[PDB]
Amino acid sequence: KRMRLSGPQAFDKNEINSIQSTEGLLEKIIKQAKHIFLRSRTAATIDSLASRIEDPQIQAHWSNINDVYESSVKVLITSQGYEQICKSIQLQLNIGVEQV
Amino acid sequence: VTCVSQMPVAEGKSLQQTVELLTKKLEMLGAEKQGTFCVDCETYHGKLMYVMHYPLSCFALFENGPCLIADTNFDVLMVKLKGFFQSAKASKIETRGTRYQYCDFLVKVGTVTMGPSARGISVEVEYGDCWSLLLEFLQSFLGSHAPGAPTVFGNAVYGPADTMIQYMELFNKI
Amino acid sequence: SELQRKDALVQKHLTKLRHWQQVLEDINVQH
Amino acid sequence: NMMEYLLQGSVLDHSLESLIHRLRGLCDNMEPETFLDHEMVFLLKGQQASPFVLRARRSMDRAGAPWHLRYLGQPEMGDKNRHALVRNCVDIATSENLTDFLMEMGFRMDHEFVAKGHLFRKGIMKVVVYKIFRILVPGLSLSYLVELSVVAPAGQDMVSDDMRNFAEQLKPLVHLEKID
Amino acid sequence: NERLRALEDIEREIGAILQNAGTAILELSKEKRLLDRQAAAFTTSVQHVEAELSAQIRYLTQVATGQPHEGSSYSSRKDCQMALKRVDYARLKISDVARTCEQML
Amino acid sequence: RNQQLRALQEECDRKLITLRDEVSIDLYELEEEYYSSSS
Fold first, then answer.
1. Residue D90 forms beta bridges with which residues?
2. How many contiguous H segments (helices) and E segments (strands) does chain D have?
3. B66 touches chain A (CB under 8 A)
4. Distance in angstroms (rounded) separating the CA atoms of residues F25 and F23
5. What are the coiled-coil residue ranges (chain C)?
6. Do chains E and B touch, with touching meaning 3 or more CB–CB pairs less than 8 Å apart?
């Protein structure tokens, strides 16, 4: 399908290569790694409790739809006893082979 | 999208030396080797052949890019009409050259084929119009050039691979 | 009050999970 | 550079479902499908009474898929103790740009009748079946013609014998025949 | 299941009462009712059974060269079972979480 | 039969997603709850 439908469009050599791909271990070679990488971020969560007790705490809110490899996590400061201080709500997305 | 090429306005020394100086300026801007391509041309009394990026060839006297197959599909047609439509005169000049990428773009300069030929350059874009901004890049490259003259008032829209017809204009410069 | 609210939320979530598992205990139709 | 083979045939009208049932479980994995085509046969001649193979019969299904024509003509000699065979080619084209260039080059049409049918993926080969439909200009054979199409480079052409094995499968009301 | 039902009916009618009724009138040496029915079922029933058997034999005959007449042959019914396994493991994990919650409260 | 078992997993898959949905809600319902603890 893709091979024949290539003709109608002057696809770059990148797309020509992307017509096919690798498989097997390589996929898992990333996937599991990605998994444990999230685990590292997990530490950050409890590290919050370690980094700040009387100091400003940290709220956690993870995604409700996570793709095969990639995903994202919303994290805001959430200063105690106040809600009008929401001036730092940073968003990160995780990466399998590379860092977040 | 597919911006049209331009004639080599810069002519003050050897064409090879001129292309070398242009590539040196491009490298001074900062790019990387993205491979080398070519642009073929074969006229038949007037179907003008062409090839660019790249697993597909093109040939059209006057049409809106009827090419969607490899050269084999077309070369077989030419070989079949060896006396019907085979009007292959003196082989039309064909250019070639490397291609670099400053940033999120692509640049390509041409070369002479028989020796008294041009060494024009070609650039494209990534939008779908917008001919004003893309000119600024060339302003950093050379002086006043690139009239463009695309198939305006069509967006038959966005000129997909139709710039090869504009390439025929470069072949007109002989 | 905070501990009471936390316990109430925990009990609500527990009841929700209980209901959820109980309704689809036999999700499989037949074999 | 390439050639094609054919062992086409035909079968009765009532005797299709029992036939295609067997044809499905011959060399296809699963999920039988079909296709509605559109005939755009052209004509390019006027100097030697020998036109080209401009039967650009292409599907009228969901867009995106490009219409095109294939080369099929001038049956060359050879095929010692074998079935039909012809050195041929294929050529894809842009959407409706092919007809545009054909009309700009001064060509005419050849047919206006469409024959939808079914397909079935063989191994190194392929099989198809279709039936002509009687329609007017703005809209016939009453017989589903079938065929065993396979295209490949020169090679050894030994697989034609394997094609003959498929002839063994098409025993009940199917056979092979040439055209003259 | 038309062919299966036809084969079942043919099997049930193979050992019909015709083979057992050929020894009924010969025992009736004291009175001669509709006894003539014991004559028409001598060979006509067997002839019809043989005709039906030959007809059933002359079916499509799918098996010609290799392994035709497939039909299961295929996909992720296996992965459907794996999905049922996912459901079971999710059940187990939910039960474990409920037990952990109960232990915590 | 395949089609049949297709449904057998299809709705099931949806159910799992539904579970996720519920779980997600529960997830969120606890996240704010995690904020309250001033340890």
1. D70
2. 3, 12
3. no
4. 5
5. 1-26
6. no
